[PDB]
Amino acid sequence: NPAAHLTGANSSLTGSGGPLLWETQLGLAFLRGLSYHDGALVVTKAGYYYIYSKVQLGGVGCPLGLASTITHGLYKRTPRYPEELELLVSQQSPCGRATRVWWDSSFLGGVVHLEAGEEVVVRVLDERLVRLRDGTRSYFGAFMV
Template sequence: MSGSGMAFPAVFKMGSEVKAFQRKERLKNLLVILALCGVFIEGCLIYHLWMRGPEQVNNINQQAEKMTQEKSEMQVMQAQLNRKKPAAHVTGCKSSTNEDGKLCWEPLDGDAFTHDISYKNGSLVIKHKGHYFIYSKIFYGETVCTEKVLFNHAIMRLTQMFDGSLELMKSKRYHCKNPNEDGLANSFLGGVYHLLEGDQIFVKVEQNQLILLQSSSENYFGAFLI
């Protein structure tokens, strides 16, 4: 072989193979680095989640306890709603045949009702002892008169502990009409009293001819256990 005209194909071939090998190595190294980065990131995420684990568990436990407490409160409220207390509301009114002014009422129709309290001849009969809110409203008209006369509205109690009736509440007002007014008036009584089983409460009105009977919302009487 002459020194001036000789070609070196083997050398060029080997050089191209070396370059290809180097590219492959660089690509392999890059893939390894990417894989290591992925492992590192995944490890960081796992560590982060593991560190937050107890906090999340505590939060879940707190939420579960709160839900349980709310459920218990709802059950208590529902039980209270389902357990109806003694109550009665009688409406309208009319004078009884007696001359003592005791009023009789409508215990069933319209808004009237009785639950665990009996109605008997104008009286509400208590079946369970306890503190009761008792109330009564009377709507009446005033008249022109030459002398002042009182309109008396009272709630009375009959009990085995005492003879006769006891006055629990009373309202007094002169019923003479004022020329500057329309001549209409309301009397309302309300209060809390401790009643015993078998006690009777009723409404007594003097000058009951003045009572105006217009609707069940104008005249009523009731009680409920508190």
């Protein structure tokens, strides 16, 4: 019964170690049987959820004196615990086939068990370009299985 799909991808928090923020109202964005708080999908009904997130990614250059790669991730928060558990993580960049401005896309999807009160957040690590389209192309939702 419960499900949700969010878009928006406010990247204002990522710099200071915060998760992405998402629209829950406008357009295809919706909450049904789930809650939302400060970028987190809050679970109301306990059980197995198929969680998913897609992140549209951009880059202005692709060199590696050291290394440039992006880390897309779905994480679990348990309110009484300081730790954000890695649930579904992808390490990604088309820089593997590079020698330039680029596009890439990260999809994460998986069935995880969630409890009432637990939250799920999306973090994108080391992003260097946010196009006007990134917020709406990127999305993050789930549905109870």
